[PDB]
Amino acid sequence: HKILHRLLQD
Amino acid sequence: HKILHRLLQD
Amino acid sequence: SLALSLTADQMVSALLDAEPPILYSEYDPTRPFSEASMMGLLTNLADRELVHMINWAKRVPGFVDLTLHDQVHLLECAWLEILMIGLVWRSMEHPGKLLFAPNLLLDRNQGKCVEGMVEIFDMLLATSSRFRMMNLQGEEFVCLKSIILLNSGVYTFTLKSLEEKDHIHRVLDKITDTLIHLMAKAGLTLQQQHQRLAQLLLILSHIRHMSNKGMEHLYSMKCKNVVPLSDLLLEMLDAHRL
Amino acid sequence: KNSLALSLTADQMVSALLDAEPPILYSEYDPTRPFSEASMMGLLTNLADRELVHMINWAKRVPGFVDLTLHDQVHLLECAWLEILMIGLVWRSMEHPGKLLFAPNLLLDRNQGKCVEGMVEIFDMLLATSSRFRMMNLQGEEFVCLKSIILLNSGVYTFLEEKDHIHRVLDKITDTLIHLMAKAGLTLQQQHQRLAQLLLILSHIRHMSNKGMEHLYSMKCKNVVPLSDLLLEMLDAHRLH
Numbered sequence: 001h002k003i004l005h006r007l008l009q010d
Numbered sequence: 011h012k013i014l015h016r017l018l019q020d
Numbered sequence: 021s022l023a024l025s026l027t028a029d030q031m032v033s034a035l036l037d038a039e040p041p042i043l044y045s046e047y048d049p050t051r052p053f054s055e056a057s058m059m060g061l062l063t064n065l066a067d068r069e070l071v072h073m074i075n076w077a078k079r080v081p082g083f084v085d086l087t088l089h090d091q092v093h094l095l096e097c098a099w100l101e102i103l104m105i106g107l108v109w110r111s112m113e114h115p116g117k118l119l120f121a122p123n124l125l126l127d128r129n130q131g132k133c134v135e136g137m138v139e140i141f142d143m144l145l146a147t148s149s150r151f152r153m154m155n156l157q158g159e160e161f162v163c164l165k166s167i168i169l170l171n172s173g174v175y176t177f178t179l180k181s182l183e184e185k186d187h188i189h190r191v192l193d194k195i196t197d198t199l200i201h202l203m204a205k206a207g208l209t210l211q212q213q214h215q216r217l218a219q220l221l222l223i224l225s226h227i228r229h230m231s232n233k234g235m236e237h238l239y240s241m242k243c244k245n246v247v248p249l250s251d252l253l254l255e256m257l258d259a260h261r262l
Numbered sequence: 263k264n265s266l267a268l269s270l271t272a273d274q275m276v277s278a279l280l281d282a283e284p285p286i287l288y289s290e291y292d293p294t295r296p297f298s299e300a301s302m303m304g305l306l307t308n309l310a311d312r313e314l315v316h317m318i319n320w321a322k323r324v325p326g327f328v329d330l331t332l333h334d335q336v337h338l339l340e341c342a343w344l345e346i347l348m349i350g351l352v353w354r355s356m357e358h359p360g361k362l363l364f365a366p367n368l369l370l371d372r373n374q375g376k377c378v379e380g381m382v383e384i385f386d387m388l389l390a391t392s393s394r395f396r397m398m399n400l401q402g403e404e405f406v407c408l409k410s411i412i413l414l415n416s417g418v419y420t421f422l423e424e425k426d427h428i429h430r431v432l433d434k435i436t437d438t439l440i441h442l443m444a445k446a447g448l449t450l451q452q453q454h455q456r457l458a459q460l461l462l463i464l465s466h467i468r469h470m471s472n473k474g475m476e477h478l479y480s481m482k483c484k485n486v487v488p489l490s491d492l493l494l495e496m497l498d499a500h501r502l503h
């Protein structure tokens with residue numbers, strides 16, 4: 001999905 | 011010359 | 021001048037007396053809406069509200085001290101914000117509804133009648149719910165609206181025009197003292213006073229955001245000639261240059 | 263969950279925010295070639311992209327932020343990202359009158375903004391904001407409070423009890439600002455006056471953001487410069503036209 005969504009949990 | 015000009019001067 | 025010599029009560033008094041009337045819409049017998057029908061009523065209303073706004077602005081303490089040029093710039097920058105905070109204020113006790121006029125009360129589903137306006141309606145309604153939950157007072161409302169008039173355009177003013185910006189900021193501090201005075205009189209503690217002040221002013225950030233969105237929408241409706249716009253309205257729109 | 267954020271003193275709020283501060287990044291500026299509209303747009307968007315990665319991790323260190331579910335976290339950042347880039351730019355440009363310090367190796371005046379169509383209007387607004395902060399003698403402790411306010415407030419009206427949590431934290435930051443001004447020796451009247459002045463500037467920052475968003479969008483829609491996938495998605499979150 002969204003890159004921002006992924007980055008917020010890495 | 012604008013309409014707003016005229017209305018501010020009445 | 022004289023606006024600097026006003027006390028907190030005289031500021032409230034001056035602002036309350038300067039309040040424009042609540043205009044009616046020319047709405048109905050012809051029954052329901054089309055996209056052009058509703059846009060017509062809204063733009064016609066906004067145009068007539070603009071005339072009263074200008075006379076209201078001149079009754080705002082310290083405004084007539086400014087040059088004609090600066091007065092034009094401030095109104096050009098803030099006119100839609102002022103319309104929005106007014107709409108939001110009088111729609112406060114009508115949850116889920118926008119009271120454009122006493123005979124024109126619209127819900128968000130009626131915002132769907134016009135392309136891309138329901139998004140703007142949603143932002144206005146949420147702001148109204150915010151004011152309602154804060155129990156926004158009329159005395160607080162008139163202070164906020166005056167702040168919008170003086171603040172929104174002051175950043176986009178080298179000469180001795182430094183005297184103009186300094187005057188605008190002196191009056192702004194005066195309205196701040198007034199807002200605090202109202203809260204202190206309301207029995208709020210020092211911590212509560214500063215918190216509520218911050219809460220009210222941060223809403224003005226959202227109101228700015230709504231105006232920018234509204235200006236774009238009104239521009240898109242203007243270009244396709246769905247609705248006829250008054251010369252005054254077209255000029256206020258032109259001042260934002262897209 | 264009563265929250266550690268609300269259980270922070272004003273001094274604890276300041277320390278956490280100061281520590282969470284992102285570093286100042288460098289531009290890919292190559293002084294061997296002249297500026298074009300494309301190369302300058304490429305330079306600034308490349309910078310913004312790398313700043314965004316640090317912003318995301320900065321946000322997670324802002325007290326109360328990670329208490330939100332992922333969906334509002336995304337929402338707040340999507341709404342405030344350009345605002346945050348702008349207040350940061352304006353802050354580090356303070357001691358550079360007439361210039362914008364995008365990077366230590368990228369210091370631009372309004373005439374260099376003319377290289378990109380319609381960008382000089384944006385530069386002017388940013389420069390004026392920088393002059394305002396410089397005139398007010400904005401302090402670093404005040405700056406980090408303002409930037410955190412922008413993050414929590416800008417997208418909160420576009421959303422229950424989740425919004426109440428955000429407002430509790432915002433009130434704590436308000437308490438922190440006043441605490442700072444009081445410690446600086448400002449009278450009680452000066453405190454609420456300055457508070458108002460700083461917060462009203464956020465209204466202009468919002469305005470600059472919406473204008474910058476439209477400009478970035480028009481650059482993208484004319485294939486002037488390729489945006490990163492992250493940047494495309496942050497831009498797409500505002501719909502625009």
Ligand SMILES: C[C@]12CC[C@H](c3ccc(O)cc3C(F)(F)F)C[C@H]1CC[C@@H]2O
Pocket residue numbers: 059062063065066069100103104105106107108120137140144234235237238239241
């Ligand atoms: C026709 C529009 C919707 C009504 C709007 C309006 C009119 C009159 C008001 O007293 C308040 C508002 C306001 F909604 F702004 F609050 C004007 C434009 C802005 C965006 C649309 O094109």
Ligand SMILES: C[C@]12CC[C@H](c3ccc(O)cc3C(F)(F)F)C[C@H]1CC[C@@H]2O
Pocket residue numbers: 303306307309310313344347348349351352364381384388474475477478481
């Ligand atoms: C390329 C633009 C100008 C630079 C801007 C930017 C970049 C990086 C920053 O650290 C700060 C800014 C900011 F200026 F926003 F502060 C991003 C877009 C917004 C409008 C233009 O398209």
